[PDB]
Nucleic acid binder design. Sequence first.
DNA 1: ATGTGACTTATAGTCCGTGTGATTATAGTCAACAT
DNA 2: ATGTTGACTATAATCACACGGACTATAAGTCACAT
Lengths: 76, 77, 77, 76
Amino acid sequence: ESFLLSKVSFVIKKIRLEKGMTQEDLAYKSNLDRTYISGIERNSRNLTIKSLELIMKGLEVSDVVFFEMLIKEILK
Amino acid sequence: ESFLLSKVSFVIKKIRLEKGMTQEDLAYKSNLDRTYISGIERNSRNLTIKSLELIMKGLEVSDVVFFEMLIKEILKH
Amino acid sequence: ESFLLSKVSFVIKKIRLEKGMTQEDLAYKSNLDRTYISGIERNSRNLTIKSLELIMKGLEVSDVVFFEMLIKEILKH
Amino acid sequence: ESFLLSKVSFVIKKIRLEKGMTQEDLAYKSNLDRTYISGIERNSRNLTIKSLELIMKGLEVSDVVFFEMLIKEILK
DNA sequence: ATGTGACTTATAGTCCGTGTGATTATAGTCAACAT
DNA sequence: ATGTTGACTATAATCACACGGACTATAAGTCACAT
Protein backbone atom coordinates (compact mmCIF):
# COMPACT_ATOMS: atom_id res chain seq x y z
CA GLU A 1 0.00 0.00 0.00
CA SER A 2 0.87 3.72 0.04
CA PHE A 3 1.76 6.01 2.92
CA LEU A 4 -0.28 8.92 1.63
CA LEU A 5 -3.24 6.73 0.83
CA SER A 6 -3.38 5.46 4.39
CA LYS A 7 -3.39 8.93 5.83
CA VAL A 8 -5.94 10.25 3.41
CA SER A 9 -8.10 7.37 4.59
CA PHE A 10 -7.19 7.91 8.18
CA VAL A 11 -8.09 11.56 7.82
CA ILE A 12 -11.40 10.73 6.12
CA LYS A 13 -12.20 8.44 9.03
CA LYS A 14 -11.00 11.00 11.59
CA ILE A 15 -13.24 13.76 10.27
CA ARG A 16 -16.24 11.46 9.91
CA LEU A 17 -15.91 10.71 13.62
CA GLU A 18 -15.12 14.22 14.90
CA LYS A 19 -18.45 15.07 13.26
CA GLY A 20 -20.31 12.05 14.61
CA MET A 21 -21.22 10.49 11.26
CA THR A 22 -21.72 6.88 10.38
CA GLN A 23 -20.32 5.50 7.10
CA GLU A 24 -23.89 4.99 6.00
CA ASP A 25 -24.43 8.71 6.41
CA LEU A 26 -21.15 9.76 4.81
CA ALA A 27 -22.12 7.65 1.81
CA TYR A 28 -25.60 9.23 1.65
CA LYS A 29 -24.29 12.77 2.03
CA SER A 30 -21.66 12.43 -0.65
CA ASN A 31 -23.87 10.38 -3.00
CA LEU A 32 -21.45 7.44 -3.05
CA ASP A 33 -21.70 3.74 -2.15
CA ARG A 34 -21.39 2.68 1.49
CA THR A 35 -19.19 -0.33 0.70
CA TYR A 36 -17.15 2.11 -1.36
CA ILE A 37 -16.55 4.17 1.76
CA SER A 38 -15.91 1.18 3.98
CA GLY A 39 -13.27 0.16 1.49
CA ILE A 40 -11.51 3.50 1.62
CA GLU A 41 -11.56 3.55 5.42
CA ARG A 42 -9.99 0.11 5.70
CA ASN A 43 -7.81 1.65 2.95
CA SER A 44 -8.67 -0.85 0.22
CA ARG A 45 -9.14 1.96 -2.27
CA ASN A 46 -6.93 4.31 -4.20
CA LEU A 47 -9.16 7.32 -4.78
CA THR A 48 -9.02 9.75 -7.57
CA ILE A 49 -9.03 13.42 -6.73
CA LYS A 50 -12.61 13.63 -7.99
CA SER A 51 -13.75 11.01 -5.51
CA LEU A 52 -11.84 12.63 -2.73
CA GLU A 53 -13.69 15.82 -3.62
CA LEU A 54 -17.03 14.15 -3.25
CA ILE A 55 -16.07 12.77 0.14
CA MET A 56 -15.05 16.23 1.25
CA LYS A 57 -18.47 17.49 0.12
CA GLY A 58 -20.08 14.71 2.10
CA LEU A 59 -18.01 15.45 5.19
CA GLU A 60 -18.80 19.14 4.61
CA VAL A 61 -15.19 20.18 4.85
CA SER A 62 -13.43 22.51 2.51
CA ASP A 63 -10.46 21.32 0.48
CA VAL A 64 -8.27 23.55 2.58
CA VAL A 65 -9.37 22.21 5.92
CA PHE A 66 -8.95 18.69 4.64
CA PHE A 67 -5.44 19.34 3.49
CA GLU A 68 -4.49 21.28 6.58
CA MET A 69 -5.56 18.18 8.50
CA LEU A 70 -3.90 15.71 6.19
CA ILE A 71 -0.61 17.53 6.59
CA LYS A 72 -0.80 17.49 10.34
CA GLU A 73 -1.72 13.84 10.29
CA ILE A 74 1.20 13.15 7.94
CA LEU A 75 3.78 14.42 10.43
CA LYS A 76 3.14 11.58 12.94
CA GLU B 1 -15.24 19.92 -14.56
CA SER B 2 -13.62 19.64 -11.09
CA PHE B 3 -12.42 22.41 -8.81
CA LEU B 4 -9.66 20.52 -7.02
CA LEU B 5 -8.28 18.94 -10.18
CA SER B 6 -7.35 22.05 -12.07
CA LYS B 7 -5.72 23.26 -8.86
CA VAL B 8 -3.78 20.01 -8.57
CA SER B 9 -3.05 20.32 -12.29
CA PHE B 10 -1.83 23.90 -11.92
CA VAL B 11 0.47 23.13 -8.98
CA ILE B 12 2.13 20.18 -10.69
CA LYS B 13 3.08 22.41 -13.62
CA LYS B 14 4.07 25.35 -11.41
CA ILE B 15 6.52 23.27 -9.41
CA ARG B 16 7.81 21.54 -12.51
CA LEU B 17 8.80 24.86 -14.08
CA GLU B 18 10.07 26.27 -10.81
CA LYS B 19 12.52 23.34 -10.84
CA GLY B 20 13.48 23.90 -14.47
CA MET B 21 12.17 20.47 -15.39
CA THR B 22 10.55 19.56 -18.63
CA GLN B 23 7.61 17.25 -19.03
CA GLU B 24 10.07 14.71 -20.37
CA ASP B 25 12.23 14.83 -17.23
CA LEU B 26 9.15 14.69 -15.06
CA ALA B 27 7.41 11.77 -16.70
CA TYR B 28 10.83 10.31 -16.48
CA LYS B 29 11.28 10.41 -12.78
CA SER B 30 7.63 9.76 -12.05
CA ASN B 31 7.81 6.63 -14.14
CA LEU B 32 4.65 7.69 -15.97
CA ASP B 33 4.28 8.31 -19.73
CA ARG B 34 5.14 11.82 -21.01
CA THR B 35 1.73 11.69 -22.56
CA TYR B 36 0.21 11.42 -19.08
CA ILE B 37 2.15 14.34 -17.58
CA SER B 38 1.02 16.37 -20.59
CA GLY B 39 -2.51 15.09 -20.18
CA ILE B 40 -2.58 16.16 -16.54
CA GLU B 41 -1.27 19.69 -17.08
CA ARG B 42 -3.29 20.15 -20.26
CA ASN B 43 -6.78 18.97 -19.50
CA SER B 44 -6.56 18.64 -15.71
CA ARG B 45 -6.98 14.82 -15.81
CA ASN B 46 -8.40 12.86 -12.88
CA LEU B 47 -5.45 11.17 -11.29
CA THR B 48 -5.27 8.71 -8.52
CA ILE B 49 -3.59 9.47 -5.16
CA LYS B 50 -0.96 6.84 -6.03
CA SER B 51 -0.23 8.58 -9.30
CA LEU B 52 -0.12 11.94 -7.58
CA GLU B 53 2.35 10.44 -5.12
CA LEU B 54 4.58 9.28 -7.95
CA ILE B 55 4.51 12.75 -9.42
CA MET B 56 5.46 14.29 -6.11
CA LYS B 57 8.43 11.95 -5.93
CA GLY B 58 9.18 12.92 -9.52
CA LEU B 59 9.06 16.65 -8.74
CA GLU B 60 11.57 15.87 -6.01
CA VAL B 61 9.11 17.40 -3.53
CA SER B 62 7.43 16.07 -0.34
CA ASP B 63 3.78 15.23 0.40
CA VAL B 64 3.71 18.14 2.78
CA VAL B 65 5.36 20.73 0.53
CA PHE B 66 3.00 19.84 -2.28
CA PHE B 67 -0.11 20.11 -0.20
CA GLU B 68 1.12 23.41 1.24
CA MET B 69 1.36 24.85 -2.26
CA LEU B 70 -1.94 23.22 -3.11
CA ILE B 71 -3.54 25.10 -0.26
CA LYS B 72 -1.96 28.33 -1.47
CA GLU B 73 -3.21 27.94 -5.05
CA ILE B 74 -6.75 27.15 -3.84
CA LEU B 75 -6.73 30.32 -1.72
CA LYS B 76 -5.92 32.72 -4.50
CA HIS B 77 -7.29 35.84 -6.13
CA GLU C 1 8.78 15.30 -53.68
CA SER C 2 12.00 13.24 -54.03
CA PHE C 3 12.19 9.71 -55.43
CA LEU C 4 15.04 8.41 -53.31
CA LEU C 5 13.84 9.98 -50.07
CA SER C 6 10.58 8.13 -49.82
CA LYS C 7 12.59 5.00 -50.57
CA VAL C 8 15.03 5.81 -47.78
CA SER C 9 12.21 6.66 -45.39
CA PHE C 10 10.37 3.49 -46.36
CA VAL C 11 13.41 1.32 -45.61
CA ILE C 12 14.14 2.95 -42.28
CA LYS C 13 10.61 2.07 -41.18
CA LYS C 14 10.75 -1.43 -42.65
CA ILE C 15 13.88 -2.28 -40.70
CA ARG C 16 12.60 -0.56 -37.59
CA LEU C 17 9.55 -2.82 -37.52
CA GLU C 18 11.48 -5.92 -38.57
CA LYS C 19 13.68 -5.41 -35.50
CA GLY C 20 10.59 -4.92 -33.35
CA MET C 21 11.77 -1.43 -32.42
CA THR C 22 9.56 1.51 -31.70
CA GLN C 23 10.23 4.99 -32.98
CA GLU C 24 11.44 6.36 -29.72
CA ASP C 25 13.92 3.57 -29.06
CA LEU C 26 15.40 4.23 -32.47
CA ALA C 27 15.34 7.94 -31.71
CA TYR C 28 17.49 7.18 -28.68
CA LYS C 29 19.86 4.66 -30.18
CA SER C 30 20.37 6.96 -33.19
CA ASN C 31 21.09 9.89 -30.92
CA LEU C 32 18.59 12.08 -32.73
CA ASP C 33 15.33 13.74 -31.68
CA ARG C 34 12.15 11.75 -30.99
CA THR C 35 10.23 13.81 -33.54
CA TYR C 36 12.91 13.54 -36.21
CA ILE C 37 12.50 9.78 -36.53
CA SER C 38 8.78 10.36 -36.78
CA GLY C 39 9.20 13.14 -39.30
CA ILE C 40 11.46 11.00 -41.49
CA GLU C 41 9.00 8.13 -41.69
CA ARG C 42 5.81 10.20 -41.46
CA ASN C 43 6.31 12.61 -44.24
CA SER C 44 9.59 12.00 -45.83
CA ARG C 45 12.32 14.43 -44.75
CA ASN C 46 15.60 15.28 -46.42
CA LEU C 47 18.26 13.84 -44.21
CA THR C 48 21.96 14.12 -44.30
CA ILE C 49 24.36 11.23 -44.92
CA LYS C 50 25.68 11.74 -41.37
CA SER C 51 22.17 11.51 -39.98
CA LEU C 52 21.41 8.50 -42.14
CA GLU C 53 24.54 6.88 -40.73
CA LEU C 54 23.36 7.54 -37.19
CA ILE C 55 20.08 5.91 -37.97
CA MET C 56 21.83 2.90 -39.46
CA LYS C 57 23.85 2.48 -36.31
CA GLY C 58 20.54 2.82 -34.47
CA LEU C 59 18.72 0.22 -36.54
CA GLU C 60 21.69 -1.92 -35.51
CA VAL C 61 22.38 -2.49 -39.19
CA SER C 62 25.44 -2.04 -41.44
CA ASP C 63 25.87 0.59 -44.20
CA VAL C 64 26.08 -2.30 -46.59
CA VAL C 65 22.92 -4.22 -45.68
CA PHE C 66 21.02 -0.94 -45.46
CA PHE C 67 21.95 -0.05 -49.01
CA GLU C 68 21.19 -3.61 -50.14
CA MET C 69 17.63 -3.24 -48.86
CA LEU C 70 17.52 0.24 -50.33
CA ILE C 71 18.31 -1.16 -53.76
CA LYS C 72 15.62 -3.83 -53.38
CA GLU C 73 12.98 -1.25 -52.49
CA ILE C 74 13.85 1.00 -55.42
CA LEU C 75 13.41 -2.04 -57.69
CA LYS C 76 9.74 -2.70 -56.92
CA HIS C 77 6.42 -3.08 -58.75
CA GLU D 1 34.47 13.23 -40.52
CA SER D 2 32.44 10.19 -41.58
CA PHE D 3 33.38 6.92 -43.24
CA LEU D 4 30.26 6.70 -45.36
CA LEU D 5 30.47 10.32 -46.32
CA SER D 6 34.01 9.72 -47.53
CA LYS D 7 33.09 6.69 -49.56
CA VAL D 8 30.13 8.55 -51.03
CA SER D 9 32.42 11.37 -52.11
CA PHE D 10 35.00 8.98 -53.42
CA VAL D 11 32.32 7.22 -55.44
CA ILE D 12 31.02 10.51 -56.86
CA LYS D 13 34.56 11.37 -57.95
CA LYS D 14 35.18 7.83 -59.29
CA ILE D 15 32.12 7.86 -61.52
CA ARG D 16 32.87 11.37 -62.67
CA LEU D 17 36.28 10.19 -63.89
CA GLU D 18 35.30 6.87 -65.49
CA LYS D 19 32.93 9.06 -67.52
CA GLY D 20 35.72 11.52 -68.33
CA MET D 21 33.81 14.45 -66.79
CA THR D 22 35.22 17.58 -65.29
CA GLN D 23 33.82 19.06 -62.07
CA GLU D 24 32.83 22.10 -64.07
CA ASP D 25 30.80 19.84 -66.29
CA LEU D 26 29.40 17.79 -63.41
CA ALA D 27 28.09 21.00 -61.86
CA TYR D 28 26.64 22.27 -65.19
CA LYS D 29 24.87 18.97 -65.75
CA SER D 30 23.19 18.84 -62.38
CA ASN D 31 22.69 22.59 -61.91
CA LEU D 32 24.67 22.98 -58.71
CA ASP D 33 27.69 25.14 -57.89
CA ARG D 34 31.12 23.97 -59.00
CA THR D 35 32.66 24.94 -55.68
CA TYR D 36 29.89 22.88 -54.12
CA ILE D 37 30.94 19.84 -56.14
CA SER D 38 34.58 20.51 -55.46
CA GLY D 39 33.81 20.58 -51.77
CA ILE D 40 32.08 17.22 -51.73
CA GLU D 41 34.95 15.53 -53.59
CA ARG D 42 37.52 16.88 -51.12
CA ASN D 43 35.06 15.46 -48.57
CA SER D 44 34.22 18.83 -47.02
CA ARG D 45 30.47 18.43 -47.43
CA ASN D 46 27.81 16.41 -45.71
CA LEU D 47 25.23 16.25 -48.42
CA THR D 48 21.57 15.48 -48.14
CA ILE D 49 19.83 12.77 -50.06
CA LYS D 50 18.26 15.43 -52.26
CA SER D 51 21.63 16.78 -53.22
CA LEU D 52 23.06 13.33 -53.67
CA GLU D 53 20.18 12.73 -56.05
CA LEU D 54 20.93 15.77 -58.12
CA ILE D 55 24.50 14.62 -58.43
CA MET D 56 23.47 11.18 -59.60
CA LYS D 57 21.29 12.77 -62.27
CA GLY D 58 24.21 14.96 -63.25
CA LEU D 59 26.45 11.91 -63.44
CA GLU D 60 23.75 10.18 -65.53
CA VAL D 61 23.65 7.20 -63.22
CA SER D 62 20.73 5.44 -61.69
CA ASP D 63 20.29 5.27 -57.93
CA VAL D 64 20.82 1.55 -58.08
CA VAL D 65 24.06 1.69 -60.02
CA PHE D 66 25.36 4.28 -57.59
CA PHE D 67 24.63 2.22 -54.54
CA GLU D 68 25.87 -0.97 -56.13
CA MET D 69 29.13 0.92 -56.54
CA LEU D 70 29.00 2.50 -53.13
CA ILE D 71 28.65 -0.91 -51.54
CA LYS D 72 31.62 -2.27 -53.41
CA GLU D 73 33.78 0.68 -52.54
CA ILE D 74 32.71 0.30 -48.89
CA LEU D 75 34.17 -3.21 -48.86
CA LYS D 76 37.83 -2.10 -49.27
C1' DA E 1 -24.59 -0.23 11.79
C1' DT E 2 -19.87 -2.04 9.32
C1' DG E 3 -16.99 -5.59 6.51
C1' DT E 4 -16.54 -9.03 3.17
C1' DG E 5 -16.34 -11.05 -1.54
C1' DA E 6 -17.02 -11.25 -6.03
C1' DC E 7 -18.81 -9.51 -10.17
C1' DT E 8 -19.57 -5.76 -14.21
C1' DT E 9 -18.48 -1.03 -16.41
C1' DA E 10 -16.44 2.96 -16.49
C1' DT E 11 -12.28 5.16 -16.67
C1' DA E 12 -7.41 5.79 -15.15
C1' DG E 13 -3.03 4.81 -17.07
C1' DT E 14 -0.14 2.75 -20.90
C1' DC E 15 1.86 2.50 -25.34
C1' DC E 16 2.95 3.93 -30.03
C1' DG E 17 2.40 7.32 -33.01
C1' DT E 18 1.10 12.18 -35.46
C1' DG E 19 1.72 17.24 -36.13
C1' DT E 20 3.53 21.82 -34.65
C1' DG E 21 5.38 26.23 -33.52
C1' DA E 22 10.32 28.22 -32.08
C1' DT E 23 14.98 27.98 -31.67
C1' DT E 24 19.91 26.41 -33.05
C1' DA E 25 23.27 24.17 -36.09
C1' DT E 26 24.48 23.52 -40.46
C1' DA E 27 23.89 22.43 -45.59
C1' DG E 28 22.82 24.88 -49.70
C1' DT E 29 24.26 28.47 -52.94
C1' DC E 30 27.10 31.88 -54.52
C1' DA E 31 30.61 35.81 -53.97
C1' DA E 32 36.55 36.79 -54.68
C1' DC E 33 40.77 35.20 -55.54
C1' DA E 34 43.94 30.98 -55.87
C1' DT E 35 46.56 27.80 -58.39
C1' DA F 1 40.48 23.49 -65.21
C1' DT F 2 40.25 22.75 -59.52
C1' DG F 3 40.91 24.70 -54.48
C1' DT F 4 39.93 27.61 -50.59
C1' DT F 5 38.21 31.51 -47.81
C1' DG F 6 34.45 33.81 -46.17
C1' DA F 7 29.99 35.07 -46.71
C1' DC F 8 24.51 34.97 -46.76
C1' DT F 9 20.08 32.16 -46.37
C1' DA F 10 17.63 28.22 -46.64
C1' DT F 11 16.74 24.35 -44.21
C1' DA F 12 18.33 20.26 -41.50
C1' DA F 13 18.03 19.11 -36.86
C1' DT F 14 16.75 20.16 -31.95
C1' DC F 15 13.71 20.90 -28.02
C1' DA F 16 9.46 21.37 -25.38
C1' DC F 17 4.76 20.45 -26.22
C1' DA F 18 -0.07 19.10 -27.81
C1' DC F 19 -3.20 15.54 -29.43
C1' DG F 20 -5.28 11.16 -31.02
C1' DG F 21 -6.51 6.24 -31.08
C1' DA F 22 -6.13 1.51 -29.08
C1' DC F 23 -5.09 -1.23 -25.72
C1' DT F 24 -4.48 -2.83 -20.52
C1' DA F 25 -4.91 -2.24 -15.60
C1' DT F 26 -7.76 -0.79 -12.14
C1' DA F 27 -11.07 2.47 -9.78
C1' DA F 28 -15.87 3.34 -9.76
C1' DG F 29 -20.21 1.79 -8.63
C1' DT F 30 -23.67 -2.13 -7.33
C1' DC F 31 -25.18 -7.10 -6.00
C1' DA F 32 -25.37 -10.63 -2.08
C1' DC F 33 -24.16 -12.08 2.74
C1' DA F 34 -21.89 -11.87 6.45
C1' DT F 35 -21.33 -9.60 11.56
